[PDB]
């Protein structure tokens, strides 16, 4: 379509021309049109084959989780709670203007709960969500029991070497390796039926009550409300932050001052992004909260059909290598055939249960996704005397120093496969948190053989891509990517459980298996997505300060200098996954290239695909890192963009460029210290381009051993003073910004100067002078948005002997009618031609056809959405041509 769709507010979408003007009467309330009540809002939208697909969600949604019986997850039918999310297909019913009509409506039903799933869900506990204001110390949790304290006990230390073989820990050199973190302090963990607090501990190693809900509601909540009162009063904020406004801003739903239960937050967050193919509509969660399910809706689905979501716990991904999946799964929980009521995701044969999804997109008939693996480990929930009582079972899985350099060798290294190994080591005088070595060294799950049947190991899901929160040195180095080998090349030692980025391309058949997994009766049915990969993607270490390397730096002491809008410098985040077809042609006989980009903290990730079979791009050499992923670090200008203010990402096929829009109005109203936020004005635009040698350019590039990449550039289009309406990327050379510098909409034209966009004030003024019409005015004597056209005098015909030629000959000779005017372009390479019309046997008229900022030509008959633009182009009559030859 020749128009740009601009979401005006949470309900209205307006169609805009390339001249940054709204099409008259195009403003449409899509919630009302979808026959949804006013509690609904637009979550996301996409165009598929000229139709508009809109995802809607209700602020009134109330979900319940009942442990007893069946159909455990349900909408709260009392009062106004049965408000499921919907996907609606709209069509434009008019040839003149925009008139949206609803074609299909798809309800997104709550997930089915099998018996095996419900045994995990009953004791499932979820960490309170990370906000803009969560500190590194907020995330820090008290260190758990050592490997020796768990297996041997409180007696002595010298018996490790002689008793480790009985507990299957042969040659394990780490009796003081941590088995996890305590759940009696720190960030709140809540059951599906429970609610998270609006309070965040400043120091989670001392404050907060962890999973101790009763301890929070009886003593600590009073302490928190006293220290951190919500604004009206003036509080202290010595011990807790009050992030209520930051929680509302990331989609946390409330009943006055109380957040709704966890399952409501999960349902509401899970219906945030959509992607459309010929057969399917796919719905995924947002990047603020972990999601446990996604919807695969068959476009053929009949009206008033409940569309069921598929659990990620039933969705087996290819993590790159089987060991990579084994690392994640072994740390999910304790799996043992001789234990009663010890149900977790591992013991019940489920896979990774949750992700922080960056987004979803479609290219051809393929779905592309990405996200971070949300941390998920086992925890001891028993009551009486357990050594790990109220402790989460988590440990570092960073590759050892003596590992062979080569991607496959590093990621399949056995270090920390089944249990703890890393911590603190000093060989001669060289210190490392990582083991120097890998019969063989034995790792084992942190459950002692005696308390095997009497143990209750359940599941937890973290709010970030970290598994282990334990306040020790290894945690910092794992989260920041600071573990390096002592070899000549000095390679980075990867984690296999912390900061794991996930991505893939999903086919129609893989979507069909997810749909049957979602509709399966009885026991769980599984889906395998084979064109997926994983990647250790830590946060930049330069987002932190004062780290000791040669007393160690832990989470409770780590100083954040993160410039990207987060108070923390340890948890990764991603946003705006967007795919795009490369406009650059491939060699004959090869399919058109396409890729995807996504923003992460401190850089852009590029995803690479082989379009020959819609697979991930790969290379034969296993020593090379999977070439379907490439990470490019941001410079200071990109790192300064507040990633929590991401509004939207668009791709332009002609330019081959992605445009990421950031809107500062998306910032919360108040701080964690209940202080009004004042830098909520303005916006920013990041432009992403591809870099490197692409596939199928010539015979030499039919195979690749180097991953194509991307480059994010804070383009020069930004403001700290205007309220943004929209950014129109007209061409590689120009962008139009619609903003309010008051209550009224203003048009600003930004011109691309050798990679850097700069405001062109004279062009802005030309474009904005439309006199209430849809397009910029036309003035004869001015070099305006249409350049300047000066017509030759009629005397040119006699002087050049063109009078001997006929009207029909002149009209059929482009080079001649180009000599009837002189053009002055308003911008370099702006083109103009004359359109000729016979008026009589001896005369014709000419009218210019002129290129605008979008690269398109406009003339007297031009329309947008079928509406005549009536620009005001002149007509010039030339007379005195021969009647016949």
Tell me which H or E stretch contains 225.
helix 221-227
- Least separation in angstroms between residue 853's CB and K ion is 14
**End-to-end CA gap in the chain:** 45
Q: Which stretch binds K ion (CB under 5 A): 62-70, 172-180, 777-785, 850-858?
A: 777-785
Rank residues 560 and 769 by Cβ distance to K ion and give the closer one. 769
Total chain residues near K ion (CB under 5 A): 3
Rank residues 621 and 790 by Cβ distance to K ion and give the closer one. 790
- Least separation in angstroms between residue 844's CB and K ion is 22
Structure tokens at 323: 């060991």
Question: Any contact of residue 786 with K ion (CB under 5 A)?
Answer: yes
Rank residues 389 and 788 by Cβ distance to K ion and give the closer one. 788
Residues near 572 by Cβ (< 8 Å), separated by ≥ 6? Answer: 372, 464, 465, 499, 501, 537, 538, 539, 600, 601
- Least separation in angstroms between residue 17's CB and K ion is 19
- Least separation in angstroms between residue 786's CB and K ion is 5
- Least separation in angstroms between residue 766's CB and K ion is 9
- Least separation in angstroms between residue 828's CB and K ion is 17
Rank residues 605 and 774 by Cβ distance to K ion and give the closer one. 774
- Least separation in angstroms between residue 820's CB and K ion is 16
Rank residues 825 and 855 by Cβ distance to K ion and give the closer one. 825
Residues 282/511, Cβ–Cβ less than 8 Å: yes
Residues 344 to 363: which contact K ion by CB under 5 A?
none
Q: Which stretch binds K ion (CB under 5 A): 95-103, 402-410, 787-795, 854-862?
A: 787-795
Rank residues 319 and 786 by Cβ distance to K ion and give the closer one. 786
- Least separation in angstroms between residue 134's CB and K ion is 56
Question: Any contact of residue 369 with K ion (CB under 5 A)?
Answer: no
- Helix, strand, coil abundance in the chain, percent, nearest 5: 15, 30, 50
Rank residues 340 and 771 by Cβ distance to K ion and give the closer one. 771
Rank residues 82 and 859 by Cβ distance to K ion and give the closer one. 859
Question: Any contact of residue 858 with K ion (CB under 5 A)?
Answer: no
Q: Which stretch binds K ion (CB under 5 A): 156-164, 718-726, 779-787, 806-814?
A: 779-787
Structure tokens at 879: 């007379």
Phi and psi, residue 664, nearest 5°? -65, -15
Residue with tokens 């202290």: 236
Q: What whole-number distance in Å separates Cα of residue 179 and Cα of residue 390?
A: 12
Rank residues 102 and 783 by Cβ distance to K ion and give the closer one. 783
Question: Any contact of residue 390 with K ion (CB under 5 A)?
Answer: no
Q: How far is CA 281 from CA 452, 516, 517, in A?
A: 45, 15, 16
- Least separation in angstroms between residue 292's CB and K ion is 59
- Least separation in angstroms between residue 860's CB and K ion is 14
Q: What whole-number distance in Å separates Cα of residue 353 and Cα of residue 571?
A: 19
Question: Any contact of residue 748 with K ion (CB under 5 A)?
Answer: no
Nearest position to K ion, beta carbon? 784
- Residues pairing with 284 in the sheet: 273
Rank residues 27 and 788 by Cβ distance to K ion and give the closer one. 788
Alpha helices by DSSP H, 60-205: 115-121, 136-139, 147-151, 160-163
Residues near 872 by Cβ (< 8 Å), separated by ≥ 6? Answer: 777, 778
Please list, residue by residue across 309-329, b when 16 or more beta carbons sit within 10 angstroms of its beta carbon and e when fewer do: bbbbbbbbbbbbbebbbbbbb
Question: Any contact of residue 791 with K ion (CB under 5 A)?
Answer: no
Q: Which stretch binds K ion (CB under 5 A): 81-89, 179-187, 473-481, 781-789?
A: 781-789
Rank residues 566 and 778 by Cβ distance to K ion and give the closer one. 778
Question: Any contact of residue 658 with K ion (CB under 5 A)?
Answer: no
Q: What whole-number distance in Å separates Cα of residue 618 and Cα of residue 284?
A: 27
Burial of 82 (0-12, 13-18, 19+ CB in 10 A): middle
Residues near 167 by Cβ (< 8 Å), separated by ≥ 6? Answer: 151, 152, 444, 448, 449
Residue with tokens 């005015």: 777
Q: What whole-number distance in Å separates Cα of residue 328 and Cα of residue 875?
A: 72
Rank residues 218 and 856 by Cβ distance to K ion and give the closer one. 856
Question: Any contact of residue 203 with K ion (CB under 5 A)?
Answer: no
Question: Any contact of residue 445 with K ion (CB under 5 A)?
Answer: no
Question: Nearest-CA neighbor of 142 among 184, 189, 177, 200?
Answer: 184
SS3 381: coil
Rank residues 460 and 832 by Cβ distance to K ion and give the closer one. 832
Rank residues 788 and 876 by Cβ distance to K ion and give the closer one. 788
CB atoms within 10 A of CB 523: 9
CB atoms within 10 A of CB 625: 18
Q: Which stretch binds K ion (CB under 5 A): 442-450, 682-690, 784-792, 826-834?
A: 784-792
Distance of CA 518 to the CA centre of its chain: 24
Question: Any contact of residue 848 with K ion (CB under 5 A)?
Answer: no
- Least separation in angstroms between residue 355's CB and K ion is 54
Taking CA 739 as the corner, what is the angle to CA 737 and CA 740, rounded to the nearest 5 degrees? 160
Q: What whole-number distance in Å separates Cα of residue 151 and Cα of residue 314?
A: 33
Residues 883/806, Cβ–Cβ less than 8 Å: yes
Burial of 305 (0-12, 13-18, 19+ CB in 10 A): middle
Q: Which stretch binds K ion (CB under 5 A): 197-205, 244-252, 605-613, 778-786?
A: 778-786
Q: Which stretch binds K ion (CB under 5 A): 444-452, 635-643, 707-715, 782-790?
A: 782-790
Question: Any contact of residue 852 with K ion (CB under 5 A)?
Answer: no
Q: Which stretch binds K ion (CB under 5 A): 236-244, 329-337, 359-367, 776-784?
A: 776-784
Among 212, 220, 472, 784, binds K ion (CB under 5 A): 784
- Tell me the HSE value of 96 on the side-chain side, using a 13 A CA sphere: 4
- Least separation in angstroms between residue 15's CB and K ion is 27
- Least separation in angstroms between residue 876's CB and K ion is 14
Rank residues 268 and 786 by Cβ distance to K ion and give the closer one. 786
Q: Which stretch binds K ion (CB under 5 A): 366-374, 567-575, 633-641, 785-793?
A: 785-793
**Site mask for K ion (CB under 5 A), range 132-151, x = bound:** --------------------
Rank residues 333 and 787 by Cβ distance to K ion and give the closer one. 787
- Least separation in angstroms between residue 780's CB and K ion is 6
- Least separation in angstroms between residue 762's CB and K ion is 13
Residues 575 to 614: which contact K ion by CB under 5 A?
none
DSSP string, 768-789: H--TTSSS----TTS-BTTBEE
- Least separation in angstroms between residue 734's CB and K ion is 18
Can you give the binding site for K ion, defined by CB under 5 A?
Answer: 784, 786, 788
């Amino acid at each position: 379509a020749n128009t740009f769709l601009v979401k005006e507010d949470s309900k209205n979408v307006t169609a805009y021309t390339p001249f940054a003007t709204p099409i008259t009467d195009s403003k449409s309330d899509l919630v009302s049109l979808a026959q949804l009540d006013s509690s609904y809002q637009i979550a996301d939208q996409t165009i598929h084959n000229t139709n508009l697909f809109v995802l809607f969600k209700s602020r009134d949604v109330k979900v319940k989780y009942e442990s007893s019986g069946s159909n455990n997850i349900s909408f709260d039918s009392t009062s106004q709670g049965e408000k499921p999310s919907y996907v609606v297909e709209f069509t434009n019913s008019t040839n003149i203007g925009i008139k949206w009509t609803m074609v299909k409506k798809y309800q997104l039903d709550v997930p089915n709960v099998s018996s095996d799933m419900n045994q995990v869900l009953k004791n499932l506990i979820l960490e309170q969500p990370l906000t803009k204001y969560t500190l590194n110390s907020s995330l820090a949790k008290e260190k758990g029991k050592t490997q020796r304290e768990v297996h041997l006990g409180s007696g002595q230390a010298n018996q490790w070497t002689s008793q480790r073989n009985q507990h299957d820990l042969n040659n394990n050199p780490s009796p003081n390796a941590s088995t996890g973190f305590k759940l009696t302090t720190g960030n709140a963990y809540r059951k599906l039926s429970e609610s998270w607090p609006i309070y965040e501990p400043i120091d989670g190693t001392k404050q907060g009550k962890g999973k101790d809900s009763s301890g929070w509601s009886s003593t600590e909540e009073n302490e928190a409300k006293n220290d951190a009162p919500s604004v009206s009063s003036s509080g202290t904020f010595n011990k807790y932050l009050n992030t209520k406004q930051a929680l509302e801003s990331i989609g946390i739903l409330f009943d006055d001052q109380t957040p709704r239960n966890v399952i409501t937050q999960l349902y509401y967050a899970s219906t945030s992004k959509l992607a459309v193919t010929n057969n399917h509509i796919v719905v995924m969660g947002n990047s603020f909260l972990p999601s446990m399910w996604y919807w695969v809706v068959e476009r053929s689905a009949q009206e008033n059909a409940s569309n069921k979501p598929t659990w990620f716990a039933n969705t087996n991904l290819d993590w790159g290598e089987d060991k990579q999946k084994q690392f994640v799964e072994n740390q999910l929980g304790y799996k043992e055939t001789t234990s009663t009521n010890s149900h977790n995701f591992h013991s019940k044969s489920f896979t990774q249960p949750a992700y922080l999804i960056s987004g979803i997109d479609s290219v051809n008939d393929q779905i592309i996704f990405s996200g971070f693996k949300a941390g998920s480990v086992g925890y001891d929930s028993s009551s009486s005397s357990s050594s790990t009582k109220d402790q989460a079972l988590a440990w570092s899985t960073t590759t050892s120093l003596d590992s062979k350099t080569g991607y496959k060798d590093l990621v399949t290294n056995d270090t920390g496969l089944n249990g703890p190994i890393n911590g603190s080591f000093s060989i001669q005088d060289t210190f490392s948190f990582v083991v120097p070595y890998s019969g063989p060294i034995k790792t084992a799950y942190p459950v002692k053989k005696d308390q095997k049947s009497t143990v209750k190991i359940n599941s937890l899901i973290n709010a970030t891509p970290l598994n282990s929160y334990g306040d020790e040195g290894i945690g910092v180095f794992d989260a920041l990517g600071l573990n390096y080998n002592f070899k000549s090349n000095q390679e980075r030692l990867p984690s296999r459980t912390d900061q794991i980025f996930v991505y893939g391309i999903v086919s129609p058949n893989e979507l069909r298996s997810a749909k049957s997994s979602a509709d399966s009766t009885g026991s769980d049915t599984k889906v395998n997505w084979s064109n997926t990969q994983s990647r250790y993607l830590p946060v930049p270490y330069n987002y932190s300060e004062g780290i000791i390397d040669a007393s160690v730096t832990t989470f409770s002491g780590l100083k954040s200098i993160a410039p990207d809008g987060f108070a923390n410098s340890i948890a990764n985040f991603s946003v705006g996954l967007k795919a795009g077809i490369d406009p650059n042609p491939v060699m004959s006989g090869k399919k058109a290239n396409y890729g995807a980009v996504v923003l992460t903290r401190g850089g852009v990730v590029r995803l690479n695909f082989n379009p020959g079979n819609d697979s991930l791009l790969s290379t034969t050499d296993n020593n090379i890192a999977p070439i379907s992923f490439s990470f490019t670090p941001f410079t200071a200008a990109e790192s300064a963009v507040d990633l929590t203010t991401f509004k939207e990402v668009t791709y332009n096929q002609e330019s081959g460029l992605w445009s990421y829009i950031f809107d500062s109005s998306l910032k919360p109203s108040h701080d964690g210290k209940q202080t009004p936020v004042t830098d909520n004005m303005g916006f920013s635009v990041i432009t992403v381009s591809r870099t490197g040698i692409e596939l199928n350019q010539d015979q030499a590039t039919t195979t690749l051993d180097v991953a194509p990449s991307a480059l994010a550039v804070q383009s020069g289009i930004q403001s700290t003073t205007q309220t943004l309406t929209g950014v129109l990327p007209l061409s590689e050379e120009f962008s139009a910004v619609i903003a309010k510098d008051s209550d009224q909409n203003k048009i600003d034209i930004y011109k691309n100067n050798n990679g850097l966009f700069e405001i062109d004030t004279q062009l802005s003024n030309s474009v904005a002078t439309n006199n209430g019409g849809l397009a910029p005015s036309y003035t004869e004597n001015r070099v305006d948005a249409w350049g300047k056209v000066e017509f030759a005098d009629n005397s040119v015909l006699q002087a050049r002997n063109l009078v001997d030629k006929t009207v029909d000959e002149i009209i059929n000779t482009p080079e001649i009618l180009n000599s009837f005017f002189r053009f002055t372009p308003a911008f370099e390479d702006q083109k103009a031609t004359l359109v000729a019309t016979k008026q009589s046997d001896t005369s014709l008229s000419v009218s210019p056809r002129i290129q605008f900022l979008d690269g398109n030509f406009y003339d007297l008959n031009s329309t947008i959405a079928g509406v005549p633009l009536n620009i005001g182009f002149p007509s010039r009559v030339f007379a005195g041509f021969a009647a016949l030859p």
